From TrEMBL, chain A:
It comes from the Viruses. InterPro entries: E217_GP41. It comes from Pseudomonas virus Pa193. This is Phage protein. Pfam families: E217_GP41.
Automatic annotation (TrEMBL), chain B:
Residues 1-92 form the Cyanophage baseplate Pam3 plug gp18 domain. This is Cyanophage baseplate Pam3 plug gp18 domain-containing protein. It comes from Pseudomonas virus Pa193. It comes from the Viruses. The lineage of its organism: Viruses, Duplodnaviria, Heunggongvirae, Uroviricota, Caudoviricetes. Pfam families: Pam3_gp18.
UniProtKB/TrEMBL annotation, chain C:
InterPro entries: Phage_Wedge1. This is Uncharacterized protein. It comes from the Viruses. It comes from Pseudomonas virus Pa193.
Automatic annotation (TrEMBL), chains D, E:
Residues 100-160 form the Baseplate protein J-like barrel domain. This is Baseplate protein J-like barrel domain-containing protein. It comes from the Viruses. It comes from Pseudomonas virus Pa193. Pfam families: Baseplate_J.
Amino acid sequence: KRILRVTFNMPYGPEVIREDLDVRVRIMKAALRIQNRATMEIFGLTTQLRESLLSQFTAWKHRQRQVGREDELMIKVSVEAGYSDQGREQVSRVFVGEVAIVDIISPPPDIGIRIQCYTRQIDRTKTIRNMPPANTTFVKFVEWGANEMGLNFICDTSYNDQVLKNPGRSITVASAILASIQDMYMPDVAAFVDDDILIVKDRDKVIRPDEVTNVNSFVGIPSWSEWGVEFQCLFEPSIRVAGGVAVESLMNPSVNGNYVITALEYDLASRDRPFYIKVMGSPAA
Amino acid sequence: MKKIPLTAVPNQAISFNAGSSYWKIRLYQNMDMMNADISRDGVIVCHGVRCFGGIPLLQYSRQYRPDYGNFVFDRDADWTLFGDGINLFYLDGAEFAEYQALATRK
Amino acid sequence: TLPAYNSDIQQALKWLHNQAPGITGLIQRKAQWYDRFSRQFWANWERDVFHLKTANPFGLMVWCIILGTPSKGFGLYPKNSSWAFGRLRQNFIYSGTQVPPPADASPGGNFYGGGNAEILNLDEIRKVLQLRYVALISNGSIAYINRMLRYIFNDDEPWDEATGLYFYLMDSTGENGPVENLAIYRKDWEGMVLLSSSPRTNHVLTSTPASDADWPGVDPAASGIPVTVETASATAPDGSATVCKLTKPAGSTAYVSAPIDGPLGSGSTVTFSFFAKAGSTRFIAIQSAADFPSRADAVFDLDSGNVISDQMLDSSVVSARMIRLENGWWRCVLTTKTVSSSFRAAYVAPAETNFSWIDSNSSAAIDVLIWGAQIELGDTPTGYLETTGAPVTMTDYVLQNAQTGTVKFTQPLPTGVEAYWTGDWKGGTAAEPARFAVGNGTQDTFTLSDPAYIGLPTSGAFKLEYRVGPALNLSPQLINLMNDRAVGIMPTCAGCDVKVIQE
Amino acid sequence: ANYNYIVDTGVIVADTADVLSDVEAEFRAALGANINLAASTPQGSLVAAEAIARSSVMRNEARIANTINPNVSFGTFLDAICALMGIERGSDLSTFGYGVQVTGRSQTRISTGSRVQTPAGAIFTVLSDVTIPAGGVATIDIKSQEYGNIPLPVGNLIIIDGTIGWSGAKVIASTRVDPGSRQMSDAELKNARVNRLAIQGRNSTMAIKAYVSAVPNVTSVNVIENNTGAVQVVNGVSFTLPYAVWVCVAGNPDKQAVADALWAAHNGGTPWDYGATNNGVPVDGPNGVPVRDPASGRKYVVKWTTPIMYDGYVNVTVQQGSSSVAPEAIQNAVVNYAQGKVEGEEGLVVGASLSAFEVAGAIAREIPGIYIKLCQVACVAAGSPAPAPGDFTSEYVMSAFGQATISVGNVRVTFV
Amino acid sequence: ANYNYIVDTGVIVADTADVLSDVEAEFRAALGANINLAASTPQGSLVAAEAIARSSVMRNEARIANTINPNVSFGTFLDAICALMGIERGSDLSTFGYGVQVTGRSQTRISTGSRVQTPAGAIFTVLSDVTIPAGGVATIDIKSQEYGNIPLPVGNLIIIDGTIGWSGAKVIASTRVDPGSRQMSDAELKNARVNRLAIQGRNSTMAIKAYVSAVPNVTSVNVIENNTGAVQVVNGVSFTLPYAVWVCVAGNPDKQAVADALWAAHNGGTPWDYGATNNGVPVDGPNGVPVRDPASGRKYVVKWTTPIMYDGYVNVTVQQGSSSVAPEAIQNAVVNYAQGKVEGEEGLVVGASLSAFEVAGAIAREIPGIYIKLCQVACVAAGSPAPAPGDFTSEYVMSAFGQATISVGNVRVTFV
């Protein structure tokens, strides 16, 4: 009994699209600069709901007009998925971001929309309000970037106490901040934004070491990869990105060990078979 | 005041970002009481804190200092009435100071 | 939280091990051992934590560490190790090279228990440690310290002045020496009865009836003759043959009403008293009137000394009581408080059954002996005063000098009539009656008796003292230990020298 | 194998899954790597026993680890901790009424557990078997089914479980209604402990202030301590003893109530002094009021002074604005400020100087738009003729033991 | 198989262990009597495992039973004992204020600009500061660590800059903040428990000492009652008023805060004495800091003093026994003990007495096996040069007023 909700944020309020409507969310997240994506195929829309949603989702009013100083320029939508049995719920949060693309995939008799949301699509920000530090340490540049983007930060790396001269004075917008933080020191320590938290950590270290996820049931088989172990699983509302995993396989006994998560491929369909999440993991140090 | 939601289960562990800190509270039924193990930003703060109504979880100063907040049970903890009837609330620094000043002259 | 916990160990033991020797034996032995060394251990250790019951000396010592008391002066370890003198103590030891079974004179005998500073009884050690906690948390308040001295050394039990229990603290406020809230009683054939310095009046027309026309009879039913007052030759409590008999015949529901000036007032406590002797009936019935139907009722059992019935037809009744007097006499007293002003009269009647009312039917002819009625305001019976068709007003005494305590009486005390007093005077309270005068029949000025002890003020500033010892039989070693300022167990304020000493 | 489950940050309690797995691994290492640890076999029974034990102890230690902390203790441990300061949890007793009248007939026998009932619930069970005599009326003893001070009003109790022959029950006035008690909760015990701590965490002057101001009808209080070693004026009141505390109480309170509060707040040793002459009204005579210490029949004597009463006269020359106002409104505003009914401004408490600027401030706050021309104030002794014009000043300064009152009749409003 | 309770000497519940015999005796007479409980057999191995588990149970029960009394407790366990008496475990601070910066032109100083004081400061700039063309601005500062710090009053050094901002300086208007550090106090919390044992009490020597010790940066305090008032001398410190509490606080606390705490532990009507000239150092000369009475009235005065600073020296002669080389770990031990870090032996306090035997004992604490030969100490006033080897003796009286401080370089050790 999968329970999947797509919650928009609109001037009227939140209009939650439940799992009764045919919905299909393909989220793909990674420990990269690039904004994590979520494609949303939603069918069964009424005329009123289509008017209330698609008309608000637009790329105008910031190009041929002005109507922009803060948020409400583009609609922010979150995704809450999970399971529910015996009356209890498991609705976690799996994506927060603003819509960028909107098309239609299925014509009548089932008018189904397909939107494309991206995390931190508010690169329509205020062109960097506070100037970046002139000479400062890496953790301090990270703190400035987090404060500029408005997100709380988790910075855990061994490169924090390294000074930089002009760390990002060429930055043009807030989104480019993450690009700069990713650009400097990129063999291991890659920074990203997971939902509302900006994470800057080494690629071989776990963000929350006490939050290891012991994994014993898999769909298919936990197989090797040129980096670590890769495996698909049924939706567990406790697996984030950059988290620690404690794979204990049966089919492949050599893949057992502790791994950190680098990528994540959510594929959630209320009215269809795919309700999986795919994990790319690398050896954890 | 931030109401931490609860689930009607004997043992559970809730992890959340509250008050500019990464809290993790494991609440479990111990004998005839509830106990809680609280960790902040990964490191463990206290183990086996006996949970009582109105009375803060982090009891001594260095754990709720500075302005880290504290957790308060509105009633005596009981997992059978979790979510509906009993709730746990988080207070930031100034609000916990005000609550302490109120509760020390009762 | 709520739904149970097992922790029984014997849960392991399925139905199979029903006739086993060994598996069930092992599980039972293991459960017994775990019980002994976890559950019994924690029960005994919680009794150890309990300071009120820290009989376990180890707990007393843990508390000496917790409070910080210097333990050199305490007397822990088991006793029976001092030889000293006497067959109840130890004896010396020698070279019993053969090791005889009696273990020569003793298994030991030592000088342990050096006096003049060290207490030996563990109960007083518990008291000392509680007192040190009080000193640690003390802010110098005197009511607080007195209440905790009460709690520790008397288990929160009030004490009389024959004890002389623990006393005040740093508060240089001397007490009294004027006399206030003074009350005087006189002891006679009426026993323990007070007297009023203010004019008290008895409102009954006649106290001792010798004629039927004295008190009329009232009977709504009027089935039989009314109650008839008959003079009787029996020794009245005053020492005379002047008592009267009330007779209720069978089938009669009448009651004698004493003529009284009316009304008596609104919202005023009213007291009725009289003297009765057991006759044919074992008990008597009385009623105080009010507005219909707010009459208060009472019934007094003259033999068992129990006021087994007091009926509130309204908010009237406050109290009912019986005072014993020699020759099987009883003063029955009823105090009634009603916001109404309709207190008209008091009705009396013999009673057949223990709960018979003022107008209950009587199956036989029952006679009772009464004498000396009295109706007054207030809420306490006073000295009986003779009334013959007169609401007699009288004032017992006037205190001419408060400081010296000499008291002047209206009339000289009759021979054999003693005087007791209570109140506070000369920095000492007398909460119990204290005799101060015996009547000689010619003198009426008498000097009070000294009440409690010590002038009290302990003149000075910023410094006072304790007072204790005749009550609790506290050890001189105890007092010496509490008198040491270095130990610091006494509640103290800096800038006050307080010595305990004092018995 | 068993780790260190005590550690320093309190007892660590692992789940019974973990302890069962640990005991199972220990048994496999002991007896054999491939031993059947099934629940029915003897080795499995031993494993289950060693798992129920070695877990009961962990739970017990975690239950009573930090039990000396009074803020988080429980049960009899909290009882013992809070009894150190005299606070004691009560006993859960029940109302124990005696002498309840029973009316019936012949030889009806009331048996134990008859369960009479008061009109407002409160089922009382009979605790003594009683046979009715030939008179038809007797007495019984009843005890409350529940615990605590269950009210037992005088009246006719209804009978729930009555025998044949029992007519009724009556609560005569001789019934000795002994109340009960409902023990005391652990939270209430902590409440009493913190109350006691608040009481005994205050010095002499603050204790006097709090205790005396807690009394009803006490409008304000001025507490002063010498703390100087010489008879002098410290900052406005001339003392008479080198080491003492002088207290002035405003308002119209009960003398015995304030005496009891001030005695309970006595620091001790430091005696009260009435001060010198005209240092506040030395009321209650030269010798202070005696009160009885609740703990012991020893009384203690207390000294305090009522303020020097002053009558304040106010002259105003307000000018009428566009809107109409009456002089009674001006007098009402002034008297409200003087009594202190206004928010923020404390009022004319003991030792508060009478300022015409403050009076004008009250007038401007309560009656905006009215333009004030001249506000003048003066102060005289109580029961004296009104001061002549010219005695009024722009501001009056008050001593440290005086209180001034402005009635509705001492305001002179002139419409210019 | 037993719990030995040390009745007054060690106050410890100690396990007796030796439970193996009892466990195999339980196996006997339950499984029979002919059981071969020798090792390498299943029953022997499992009975040994049972004995080990019971030994662990006894150890854990003994530890949890012992943790109630202090001197054997540890974190979050000794903390409950402190909280029983209300000895607050302690609070944190990390914030400076009102610094100064001199720079070039039109520069924006950087958030969390790092600057180091000569004692390895490592202080960040709090506010996002932009300078002015005049050439001077103010920055707020915070220390890198939560630890207690005291910066030097002169501008020292910088780390994070732009080659333009010249230097950070400190002015008198800059404020200093007084921090704690987790519980620091891990064993000196045990040391300070015996002193701050009347936090919840007021109006006493112990209460005054505890409450003023609770003030941050009060490393020690001495309070003398002088109760037998005839002027005279009582426990040292000549006096002027007959009876007055004399308070000597060490460290560098806030004047207003320590004065308010001293006032709150008012004592009632006993004055403050700190005269006799050399007895301590006057805080504000005559007429000390006023402070305000919370029981609103008047403006009092609280007078205390600070100790006379002393500079101690130590020369040790060791032998480097046991072939364990440790050249310069001795003066670290000496200063560590002097600061009060060691457990059970409070170091150099306001009332201490620098002793050669005590410092030799501290050295033996931190490193045994060196065979200390000579341990001369001596000390001089706050200034003055080294006292020469002639002054070096085995004992310094160090009267009740005055505090000695031992430096890492003042201690020298010679190997023979």
